[PDB]
Amino acid sequence: MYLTMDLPDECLIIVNKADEFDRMLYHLQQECVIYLASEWMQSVCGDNQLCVLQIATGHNVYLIDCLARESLRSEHWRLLGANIFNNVNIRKVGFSMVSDLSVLQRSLPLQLRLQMPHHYLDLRNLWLELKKQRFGVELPFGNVNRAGDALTDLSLACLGKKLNKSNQCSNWANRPLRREQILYAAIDARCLMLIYNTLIERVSFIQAVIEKSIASNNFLRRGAHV
């Protein structure tokens, strides 16, 4: 079966007004790990359209409306960048993070500081580091050496459920979002928390692997697109 949202509806927090954004900044600043996902629209000739930014904590998910630009002003985005993204004491966990950060940086005035990005953890890079083990790594639902590299493969091996890709190809610009869209976007962030916490609890040498992975981060130098 597919991964479902385990949080109560009250813990999925839609942010499309300034007072909601200010409250979110207050809570995010007190966390030491958050989990990043986004939803955006693309075409062959058009500019990318960033629609949703998801920031999960260990206990809730913020769904920020990136099209709400008359209520969410430049200074809001700048402070999200300065206080949270650029804060070396908050670990930002994501998956395939060059793509996510590129769309964010080009769409929003976050002014990300990308030198020495050791406060970002890309689970895709961490997964590849685990696969460098000679005998693999045994997880609750399989060995990393038998798993693929997509986010749904991490979810299967760690949590035992695939990600439901229904509503993946919806119109992320529709307002209000359908319930199925809110759940899909929230799962995209919450599953990173569940995967990360599975590795933290179940892989005895995980801290050495994390340090190697965060050391390999490079967002400023060109790398091959994957």
Next chain:
Amino acid sequence: MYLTMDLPDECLIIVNKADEFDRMLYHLQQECVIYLASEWMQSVCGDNQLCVLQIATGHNVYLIDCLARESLRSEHWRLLGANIFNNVNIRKVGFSMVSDLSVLQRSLPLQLRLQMPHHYLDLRNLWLELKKQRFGVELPFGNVNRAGDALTDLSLACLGKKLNKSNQCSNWANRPLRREQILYAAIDARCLMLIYNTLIERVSFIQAVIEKSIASNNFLRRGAHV
């Protein structure tokens, strides 16, 4: 084990001069199916750098140097767009084609005609269409309903080998390319041919599925990034 290049070295044709490009146009114009892949570099704040465009036929692979812009002039790219990409009598087979075509269109003056793109076949979309079957589809090395959606998953199910991701994260702008880079780029295109031909030969109702897939193509309207 991993998929290896089966073609002789002479059938991997590097194109970085005008006379080579003109000869390629002559041969491509006589094909009715070609297979498209590309290699490019990205960073969070920099512009995407298109490095290699791979165009495979059934019997060889062209590796076009997209950085050779003093020898490969605008009219060369325009004629590749007009004579081959925009030619409704040549099927262009690819995988995750919005991303590929977006980088091509923004980097090169191909002037792609994207209305009614029924002469493109995206194997990723075709794969998802096959997964809509109630009982799955049995392929030589597994059922589509047990496979993932990455290109390496199509390769495993159809051909029995994963794609080697060593040299995936190389510097695609280095000249000359290392031998390992030429082979990786050539496999990225050649494997589409091997997968397509496996489906053509082994799935009895494949033509109805192809028609549904090509009908769903839309490159002009915004769609969710996957």
